[PDB]
Structures are given as C-alpha cells and as structure tokens.
Design a protein around this nucleic acid. Structure first.
Ligand SMILES: Nc1ncnc2c1ncn2[C@@H]1O[C@H](COP(=O)(O)OP(=O)(O)O)[C@@H](O)[C@H]1O
Ligand code: ALF
Ligand SMILES: [Mg+2]
Ligand SMILES: [Zn+2]
Lengths: 662, 97, 87
RNA sequence: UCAGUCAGUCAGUCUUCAGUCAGUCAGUCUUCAGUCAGUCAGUC
RNA sequence: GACUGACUGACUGAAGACUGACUGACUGAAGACUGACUGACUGA
C-alpha cells in the first residue's frame, strides 16, 4: 500500500522527474516512505525505458542499517527488486563491486562507499543512478558525505568544461534541521543554508506550504518539563584536603579551584612540561592529582561507589606494577591514600548520602512510569559510556525501581579499556528486546539520537547533556508517541539551561532563515550556488598543497627514553612496522632491558620505574613485543629537544618494514 | 570582547539588568530589526561627563532628545525612559570666563 | 576590488609580476623595485591574493595632473566594484 | 576649516594548536562449541 | 559379520582480547593582518 499522504506527494512532486533536490519535513513524518516510493518510481520508469538503473542508500550510523533495511525496504519491495543490506560488521564473502553488480538497491554506510572509491579496480560514481542520502545535514567540512559529493562536483565542472559528457547520477538528501554554523546574523544563517545546498548540488529546498493543518495533526509537540536541582557531604571535601595536601607537597599553584575543566587541562599540560624537564617527584604527583580530579568529576555526575572504585582500581594496579621490579615520593602517596581510602569506603558505602541529580532522576522516573500505568517507554540520553553503564547498575540495585516494572538496559556503540566493550550482536538483540517491551527503560549515548522509529516513546530524557541544535531537535523527535514528554535534568551549577535557551533562539533563527531562502530569485540562486561550488574546490586544493608540504627524514636520527625514568631505550634503527600498522622492536638486548608482566595470552611491558611500555604480540609465527609512542620520549641528534606525541602519525620518521629472514 | 552566541535584542529580552559598553547599544540602534530606546525604562550612564560634541553618549541622547521634541509636537505620546548619569567633574570647555 | 567593503585588493596577473614578495611566513609583504613596501598577501574564500595600502602609493588623476596622497581610504571619493568571484 | 601625533572603542578575514568524549572503518592473532562427512588402528 | 577408540579437514554458529588511522561535536587557550569611528594634545 504505497499510498502517500497528500503533503508527502506534494513535496515529492519535483522529485518525480529528474531534479536532484532536497526534502525536509519535521521529525516523525515518515520521510523514509517518501524515499521508498520515489525509489520504486525511479526503477520502474528506468526499466520502462530500458536503461541500467540503480540506487544506493547511505546511512551514517550502523544500527540504522538494519532498521531501515528490514522495516521500510524489505516489506514494500519483496516482489519487485533485489534489496541488500550491508554494513562494515557483516562478514562479506564477495568484493564490493560484485555486490553492487548483483543487486540493484543497496543500503550501506557511507564509509564503505568512500573506501571503495579511492582504490583506483573499485567502482565509479557513474555506475549509479539515484543516490539516496539520509540525514545529510552532516554535509560539512571534510565529513564522509563531503568527500563523495566533492567527487561528484568535480565531475560536474569537468562536464561544463566538456560542453563549452558523462551522466551524473541524480541526488536526493533528507534532513530535519540543517541548522546554522553558530550564527548570530541573519546573513550567516542564510549563507549557511546556501553552503549546504551547494555542497549537495541541490535545486530547491521544497518544504511544505499547502497541507499545513493535517501536518499539525500528525506531528505532536512534546510537553517540556524542567528538572533542576541544587546536600552537603564531606566526601567531596574529604578528597579536597587530601589532594590539596598533595598539591602543597610540591607547592603547585592551581590558578583555579579544583574539580574544573581548566584545572584538568592545566594539570595535563604542566604534567607534560614536568616530563619534558625530566622532573621526577613531580610528574607522578601531577598524574595522581589529575586522577583525583577526574574521579571527582565522575563523583558529582554519578554515585559515590563507582567513583571510589575507579580510584581504587588505579592505585591497586599501581602498586601491583611497582612490586614487580622487586622480583621515595612514590610511597609518600599510598601511605596516606590507603588509610584515607579505607575511611572513604566506609563513608562511600553509606547510601543515605546521595547526589542531587540522581535524586531528581529517581523522582522523574517513578512519577512518569506510575502515571502511565504500564504503557511507557523511556529513553535516557547521556554523555559518557561508563555513565550509561553505571546508571544501569544503579537501576539494578535499588529494588524500589523494579517494583514499578521498569526494565532497563544500556545501549552503546562498539569498540574501551574499562569494564567491558559491548559488541554489535548484543546491541542488535537489545534493540530487538526494546521493541518487544520487556526492556522498559533504555539508557543510550550519542549513537542513537538520529533514526530510531520506535512507535511508543512516551518519555525522552536528557541527563546533563550540552550540545548543538541538531542534537536537540533530533532528541525531541525521538518521542514518536502521543502525549510525549521531554524532560531536561541538570543542576544550576553549570551552563545547562542557558545552553537550552540559546539553542531555542538558534532554532527559531533557523526556521525563519530557511523561510527566507525558500523565497529567493532563481537566477541569483544559481549564481550564488555556482560561486559556492567553486569556493569549496579551490580551498580543497589549497589545503592539499598545505598538507603535502607539511609532511616533511632519517630513520636513525632519533632515540627513545622513558618518561618515569629517562634511561635510553633504543635508537631509530631498531623499530620495524607490521603492515604499515604496528610498530615493534626485535632487538635482543632491548628484550633484556624491559620486564614482562601478566595478570596471560599477552604480556604487558614494564620499565624499571614500573611504567608500561608496550604489549607482547605474536605475528607470522614470531614472538615479539611492541611499543606505544605515548609511553616514551623522542630525542633528536641535531637539536636536543625533549618531545612527545600521542600517536605515531605526527612523527615525520619513516620506518623500514619487517626483515622477516630472522 | 565576550563571544556572544545570541543576538543583542534577545539578550535584553531575557535578562533585565544589563551592564554594557555604549558602542554596543549604538550599534544595535542604527540597524533599522534591532531595538528601540522605548524598550528600556532606566538608563544608568556612568562617567557621563564625556557627553560632548559627537561622542558615543551624545548620539544616544540625541535620539532621546529628538523623540522628546516629537512628543511635544504630539501634545499640542510614547514614554521616554528615565535617565541617570554619574559624574565627578563636569569641567569647563577651556573657559576663562 | 574590495572585500566586504573592508579591504581593497588587486587581482591583475601582470601586476602580480611587477612586485616582489618577501618573508621573515603565513603572509608575505610586498616590496617595490625601490624596496618600499606596498601591501600584504591575504587569503580569502579559497583565493590567493595580495592587497595594497593607499598610504604606500600616489594617486594621479586624468583631468588634472596633481600628485596627491591620503593616509586612509575614506578620503578618496572613488567607489570600487566588489569581487567578480567567478575567477 | 584642516593637518599631525597619541590613546580608546567596535567590526571583519584567516591560519593554526591542545585536551577529553563519542561515533565510523580496516588489520594481525588466539580460542571454543555442535553436527556431518572421510581416512587410519586395535582386540573379537 | 558386528564393536570400540583416536586423527584430520570442510561447513555453521558464536565471540574473548590487542593495536592502528580517519571524522565530528564540546571546552580551553591562542598568533597575525586589516578597516573604520571617537576623544585628548600640539601646530597653522
Ligand atoms: N502514509 C502513511 N500512513 C501511515 N503511517 C505513516 C505514513 N507515512 C509515514 N507514516 C509513519 O511514519 C513512520 C516512519 O517514520 P520515519 O521516516 O522512520 O521517521 P523520520 O521521517 O523522522 O525519519 C512510520 O512508523 C509510520 O507510522
Ligand atoms: F526525521 Al528522522 F530519523 F528521518 F527522525
Ligand atoms: Mg529518519
Ligand atoms: Zn623508566
């Protein structure tokens, strides 16, 4: 029953006949159906005229691949065409070009296509006819969509050089909120819309102007409700005087109060400086106080227990690493820490003392679910993964939650160095369970703010989140249910509600501006569009030359040193790379220098100081330990400067690969 | 210097006591949407001895004065916000009389 | 040609050949044959382009051959076209 | 009416850096369970 | 003629750990350039 509602057909009218264009409707008005219907017409008409016609659907988040695959494309075209849903996780058994050569409707993630296009056999953009691009507002400065569209745009200008051609496939892109690039001018807003349009090579925004009231009947504005809180507990201040004593021992000036982002930034940078000097007795202290700071930050966000466990785990493994070498400022720390931490665990265990935010959260959950009486799905959006997982535990523990029938689970993306990484198969079944409804409360992160189509979402909740305007429009859109309630929770300490306010005004700017561009004069539209097209290309070329000149290298010039100690580790010639991917050292005396340690299939490298260096790896039948450039210090031979790099790509050195004859 | 993220008219529409530098207001008043002097009630002007030949204060007060005379033309009105100005030394314009 | 009613600049290619760039750099300084400076290199909207300062030059009219100078651009009653960006 | 010097305010154009977080992609390895089929060896 | 034990491969299913790179948003800091306006001083 591919029967569109009136406004849908209305805004689809220009699309039915060429005219690569854009469609934007407010969230929850089934744009996917417009895509499906347009696709059917395109393929059928091309079949009537008998030309090779295909269509590729690009999505930017893995979960949506399976959703859009089995929810809107399978059920409507099981008899008419060959639709295949492919993502980077599914184990292919056939090359991408043959995958496309077999089917005709593809649903894939954009990174796959771009990979397949820079492999010049690969594939050419011309092989396609219709390019459906969902959630294309991400078309911005060097994003995955921008690369693909820049190839398309380059070819178009080449065609214009030819005229004074090769067909360029028709383009469609779906948005809900193009947004502004942080603009307090009407000019910058409308400019920004134009920049998106040109980079999409669109023709007309084409947003509804006829069937307004029925639209007002379909979409529902959720009810906004504010939960803002602002109890004294020594634990915060207990950590305070401990860490102030720590800072005063080395008599550091904070330049700001503790527990703040500037303090953390200062701590990291000064720790880098101290390591540059080679200053021990300070470096370690700086790192430890930093650890306290992040512990406090988690502490304010979540319950006491996990924050303590984080610190306890760090110091436990710290002394574990230290005692390995057995087989002055160091002990200066644990001695006081361990008495204090025993006391803290005594203080932390007391559940009567509680965070302010968590309190209001409990109030909100209970109020909403009880008022709903077993007809309620709620989505809570957070910031950090461990926040999601700990909040899941917090739901688990207090039995007062379960009595109300709330069933909770945590959903995060794949891939760290923590409790446990959740894998793709698990989240796939998790969303399956959520749709069924015996998982009643879902705790999610950034991963699932764009595209979820659960027909029952009475509750959408934001937990201390700060973000741009699109990440708020979409969040309000998720409540795809009647009497939908959108709740913001935060404490007045930070800039949260003010971010909400500015986001609101920015939203209104965006609507007015898109109405403004909606009514421009076609020739001026064309001129401005063309000029913008040019601008992107020339700037890309300039960046290209800048980068290639920036790349500028003796593979022996440098030598590596510890940070905790400064003992020379090895020279430039000792390092070899596996598959351009992993640096490693084979030197046998260098094997004697370090220490292995296990808790194991892989061993961790430990210095004489106790600092880690690398991990044991086995490759092509060889046994061999690798190293991380973060763990070391670079020393040149022309200039004796002490430098560090978080990753390997910064270092301009190039290494020989692996003589495997050894 | 502070990086705004919201237009001046909405800044005023949100709060009620503003502390700003005069050039900001005058910029926002010659943009005829902008803002109208009538939107305010009390204008505290600190160190107003600088009110002189084509200074930042003189422009603003000249809009106010123009409206006042228009009001007198109306009478023979639109409220004009109350004005306060603080000085320590009005001084003389180089006068030996 | 002017950028945003703010910065005067010249695009002419032979005029590009006349002057000299110099660096001590992200921007280059223009140098005459005499060695006197003329302007500074600037990059705008993806284009590479050197500007000029009216203080560095001398104006010559065609109705009256008078040699005049101006410290700033606002004195000069001339009005300039903006930037054809199609190049 | 003008010039010169100095100080102050405001607005554009850029280039670039660090830190944390989240998402996407590709490798090298290792390990396990279950079923089925095949080859081989013993004592009767 | 029947019994048992062990080996190997293919298929399927699952997944525990490692490391690498690109990208975005946020915050913080930030070097240069240029433009115009206004006042004070002095001078004719
Ligand atoms: N013609 C229609 N009849 C009934 N429901 C429709 C129709 N068109 C759209 N919908 C609704 O739209 C939903 C799909 O929306 P979707 O496209 O996933 O959201 P968005 O447009 O925000 O991406 C379906 O659940 C369906 O209920
Ligand atoms: F409008 Al949507 F996913 F396309 F919420
Ligand atoms: Mg959608
Ligand atoms: Zn060491």
């Amino acid at each position: 029953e591919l029967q569109l509602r009136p406004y849908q057909m209305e805004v689809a009218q220009p699309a039915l006949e060429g005219k690569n264009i854009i469609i934007c409707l407010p969230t929850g008005s089934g744009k996917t159906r417009v895509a499906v219907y347009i696709a059917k017409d395109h393929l059928d008409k091309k079949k009537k005229a008998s030309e090779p016609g295909k269509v590729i659907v690009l999505v930017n988040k893995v979960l949506l691949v399976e959703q859009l695959f089995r929810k809107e494309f399978q059920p409507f075209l099981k008899k008419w065409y060959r639709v295949i849903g492919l993502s980077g996780d599914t184990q292919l058994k056939i090359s991408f070009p043959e995958v496309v050569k077999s089917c005709d409707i593809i649903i894939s993630t954009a990174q796959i296509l771009e990979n397949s296009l820079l492999n010049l056999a690969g594939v050419q953009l011309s092989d396609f006819s219709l390019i459906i691009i969902d959630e294309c507002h991400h078309t911005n400065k060097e994003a995955v969509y921008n690369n693909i569209m820049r190839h398309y745009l380059m070819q178009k200008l080449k065609n214009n050089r030819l005229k004074k051609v090769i067909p360029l496939p028709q383009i469609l892109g779906l948005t809900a909120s193009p947004g502004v690039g942080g603009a307090t001018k009407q000019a910058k807003a409308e400019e920004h819309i134009l920049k998106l349009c040109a980079n999409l090579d669109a023709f007309t925004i084409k947003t509804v102007k006829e069937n307004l009231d029925q639209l007002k009947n379909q979409i529902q504005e959720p009810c906004k409700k504010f939960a803002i809180a602002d109890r004294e507990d020594p634990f915060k201040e207990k950590l305070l005087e401990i860490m102030t004593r720590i800072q005063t021992y080395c008599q550091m000036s904070p330049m700001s109060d503790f527990g703040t982002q500037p303090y953390e930034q200062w701590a990291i940078q000064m720790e880098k400086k101290a390591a540059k000097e080679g200053n021990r007795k300070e470096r370690v202290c700086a790192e430890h106080l930093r650890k306290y700071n992040e512990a406090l930050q988690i502490n304010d966000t979540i319950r006491m227990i996990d924050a303590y466990t984080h610190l306890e785990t760090f110091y436990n493994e710290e002394k574990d690493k230290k005692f390995a070498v057995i087989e002055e400022t160091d002990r200066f720390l644990m001695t006081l820490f361990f008495e204090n931490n025993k006391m803290l665990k005594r203080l932390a265990e007391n559940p009567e003392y509680e965070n302010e935010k968590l309190t209001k959260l409990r109030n909100t959950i209970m109020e909403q679910y009880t008022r709903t009486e077993e007809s309620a799905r709620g989505i809570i959006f957070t910031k950090t993964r461990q926040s999601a997982y700990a909040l899941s535990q917090w739901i688990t523990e207090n039995e007062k939650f379960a009595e109300v029938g709330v069933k909770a689970h945590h959903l995060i993306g794949a891939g760290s160095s923590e409790f446990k990484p959740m894998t793709q198969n698990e989240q796939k079944e998790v969303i399956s369970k959520f749709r069924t409804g015996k998982i009643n409360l879902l705790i999610a992160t950034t991963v699932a703010e764009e595209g979820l189509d659960i027909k029952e979402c009475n509750i959408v909740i934001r937990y201390g989140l700060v973000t741009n305007e699109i990440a708020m429009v979409q969040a309000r859109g998720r409540a795809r249910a009647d009497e939908s309630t959108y709740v913001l929770v935060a404490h007045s300490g930070s800039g949260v509600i003010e971010r909400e306010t500015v986001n609101d005004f920015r939203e209104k700017m965006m609507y007015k501006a898109i109405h403004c561009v909606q009514n421009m004069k076609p020739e001026e539209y064309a001129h401005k569009i063309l000029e913008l097209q040019m601008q992107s290309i020339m700037e890309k070329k300039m960046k290209t030359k800048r980068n290639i000149a920036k790349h500028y290298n003796n593979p022996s010039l440098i030598t590596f040193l510890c940070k905790n100690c400064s003992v020379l580790a090895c020279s430039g010639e000792d390092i070899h790379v596996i598959e351009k991917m992993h640096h490693v050292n084979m030197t046998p005396e260098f094997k004697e220098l370090y220490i292995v340690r296990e808790k194991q299939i892989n061993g961790e490298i430990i210095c004489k100081c106790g600092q880690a260096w690398g991990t044991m790896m086995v490759h092509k039948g060889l046994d061999l330990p690798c190293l991380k450039i973060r763990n070391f210090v670079v020393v040149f031979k022309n200039n004796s400067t002490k430098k560090q790099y978080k990753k390997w790509v910064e270092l301009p050195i190039t290494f020989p690969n692996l003589d495997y004859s050894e």
